[PDB]
Design a protein around this ligand. Sequence first.
Ligand SMILES: Nc1ncnc2c1ncn2[C@@H]1O[C@H](COP(=O)(O)OP(=O)(O)OP(=O)(O)O)[C@@H](O)[C@H]1O
Ligand SMILES: Nc1ncnc2c1ncn2[C@@H]1O[C@H](COP(=O)(O)OP(=O)(O)OP(=O)(O)O)[C@@H](O)[C@H]1O
Ligand SMILES: Nc1ncnc2c1ncn2[C@@H]1O[C@H](COP(=O)(O)OP(=O)(O)O)[C@@H](O)[C@H]1O
Ligand SMILES: [Mg+2]
Ligand SMILES: [Mg+2]
Lengths: 524, 125
Amino acid sequence: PDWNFEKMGIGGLDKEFSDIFRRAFASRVFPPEIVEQMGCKHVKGILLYGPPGCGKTLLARQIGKMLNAREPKVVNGPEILNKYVGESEANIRKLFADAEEEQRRLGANSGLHIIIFDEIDAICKQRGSVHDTVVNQLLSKIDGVEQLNNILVIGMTNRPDLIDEALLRPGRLEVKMEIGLPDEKGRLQILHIHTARMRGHQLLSADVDIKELAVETKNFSGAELEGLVRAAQSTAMNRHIKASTKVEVDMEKAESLQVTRGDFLASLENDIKPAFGTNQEDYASYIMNGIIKWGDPVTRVLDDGELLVQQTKNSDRTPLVSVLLEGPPHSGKTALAAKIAEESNFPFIKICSPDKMIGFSETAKCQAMKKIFDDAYKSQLSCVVVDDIERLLDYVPIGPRFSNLVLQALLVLLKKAPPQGRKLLIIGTTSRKDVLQEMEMLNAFSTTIHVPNIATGEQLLEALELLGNFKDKERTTIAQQVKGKKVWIGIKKLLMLIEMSLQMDPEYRVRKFLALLREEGASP
Amino acid sequence: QEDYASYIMNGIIKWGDPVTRVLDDGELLVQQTKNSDRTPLVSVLLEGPPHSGKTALAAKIAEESNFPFIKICSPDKMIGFSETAKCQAMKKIFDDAYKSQLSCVVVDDIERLLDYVPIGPRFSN
Ligand SMILES: Nc1ncnc2c1ncn2[C@@H]1O[C@H](COP(=O)(O)OP(=O)(O)OP(=O)(O)O)[C@@H](O)[C@H]1O
Ligand SMILES: Nc1ncnc2c1ncn2[C@@H]1O[C@H](COP(=O)(O)OP(=O)(O)OP(=O)(O)O)[C@@H](O)[C@H]1O
Ligand SMILES: Nc1ncnc2c1ncn2[C@@H]1O[C@H](COP(=O)(O)OP(=O)(O)O)[C@@H](O)[C@H]1O
Ligand SMILES: [Mg+2]
Ligand SMILES: [Mg+2]
């Protein structure tokens, strides 16, 4: 009555198991006398959906085991498809032969047969963005003129909004469910289960706390914890063999192959890369030279970002926030966005950009953006960054010319609430405010911030001091010449100019740098 | 009873007189469409400045009608669709509405259904 899930695998899904047994399989756990006296028919299908690699197959196999059914006949979606005519239907019909045979011979006493579909969304006609006959055959077989009373079909899918509606009516697959990402308790349980054999031989637990490893893994999924365990084992073995080969140690340590905490923490740091979690190896690719404070505006922008983060974290009546950074070109409006995102400590941080869409048509860009937002919707806290909204739209002053589909997709996606009980933050970046204002986009954004350039000689002198690429004697002349206060330059352009000037002999450096700076006498 | 609670997030407040006028007019239109023989089809359009709350009042008017069929054809369920898919989906919803004996369909954010942009202009004919 109270089930036995926790004993064998399926570490973190107790509540789901209780719910599923309470909801559907009520007539299979009753004295058949009363059930027959009432005349109630059993359920003939269920459906599970969620993120990949979260433990759906294990649940299906355990459900099959608990009901004391025959061996399941697993099947995969793409495998059931062919280019010839009337071949997919044969594959679909081939599954129920044993069920028909036992329904005929044994009459009304045969046992259960469970079929396990996978990627059921592959064979479906809803892809408006497939041989409709296939789903027609499946529905005819599951429910038709001839009735089967000893079957149970379990479905699996990653996208639950691509499923044909007719396949979800009562009498067919009619009990849905969601297996979500695990939490702390779950992570401790999965880790203990997987590690429970190694500690059997007392070759682990050498000052390695499972709870410590558990609070380190923030948004790890199921299979990735096992992958971390595997990688730690392999790395420790390699280290031990190398060390023993290096030194003529006695047999005492030659036998010792113990795994260490340092192995679990190095493998976590450098080997496993989460799919739904943070990613530290791409921030350096944007904020390369770091943030140097050259004036108040940097402090103002960072404080405003902190305030917005605090507003979005703890709040109610407003679960979606947006913001836009605007400024003249070469002002460094991507480094600041990256820094603001990093300083929030959110579990899921992502950075979309056009660098990974070279040559893509508009439709592919729409699909990629939709997938990124779908990933963002599967967590309790999120932060998405859009790099250059002008390049994503494919804008060009002549014409004007651009793509409307991507613009409509962005406009719709900037005003969509996440599923119940979750928060989201969006941070844009652009250098053309007027065009966006003409296109009505700026009305959608909740707020805006301004990123100015350098405008005073003292600011440039302080920037040069902080960067440290010129000496006092040269600094004197530079200050004398820049006292005129007529300066309009960007930090990136300043870096480029300095590196261009530093290429010649130590005599003409100041003169060349001054000439180049003077040539760039812009005037807003 | 999930879409109506999904769209009316923070309820309906009585911040003035206009709310009452809007609700009364909606009630009168509903009553007209309930009892008549020469006017079997009725239409009404709500318009106003942006951020004025024109998707909550329509949802409330639809809910308070006690009709046996109600649907909301919002444009946020059709992200990335092509024109033909949009037409087919709208036709499906309306055709389903035809098979009942008393219904009410809500069309939300018309300008976003046409893909309008002041530059050009451009849209889907
Ligand atoms: N205080 C600072 N703020 C921003 N960037 C800084 C600062 N100090 C140094 N930098 C450096 O400036 C660069 C930021 O320029 P970035 O590449 O973001 O320009 P951008 O605005 O993206 O240019 P464009 O808009 O033309 O693409 C980085 O290399 C960063 O390390
Ligand atoms: N008297 C009221 N009338 C309308 N909405 C109200 C009222 N009191 C509170 N609200 C709340 O205001 C919000 C309605 O805003 P809504 O999203 O409908 O604006 P909108 O007109 O759709 O904006 P847009 O047209 O730009 O999408 C809801 O949270 C609703 O509960
Ligand atoms: N709750 C869990 N407890 C233990 N291991 C799990 C759990 N969930 C997933 N796994 C691990 O992940 C794998 C199972 O993933 P699977 O059920 O095939 O998911 P999917 O079919 O969605 O890819 C196995 O390696 C299993 O050990
Ligand atoms: Mg940029
Ligand atoms: Mg609206």
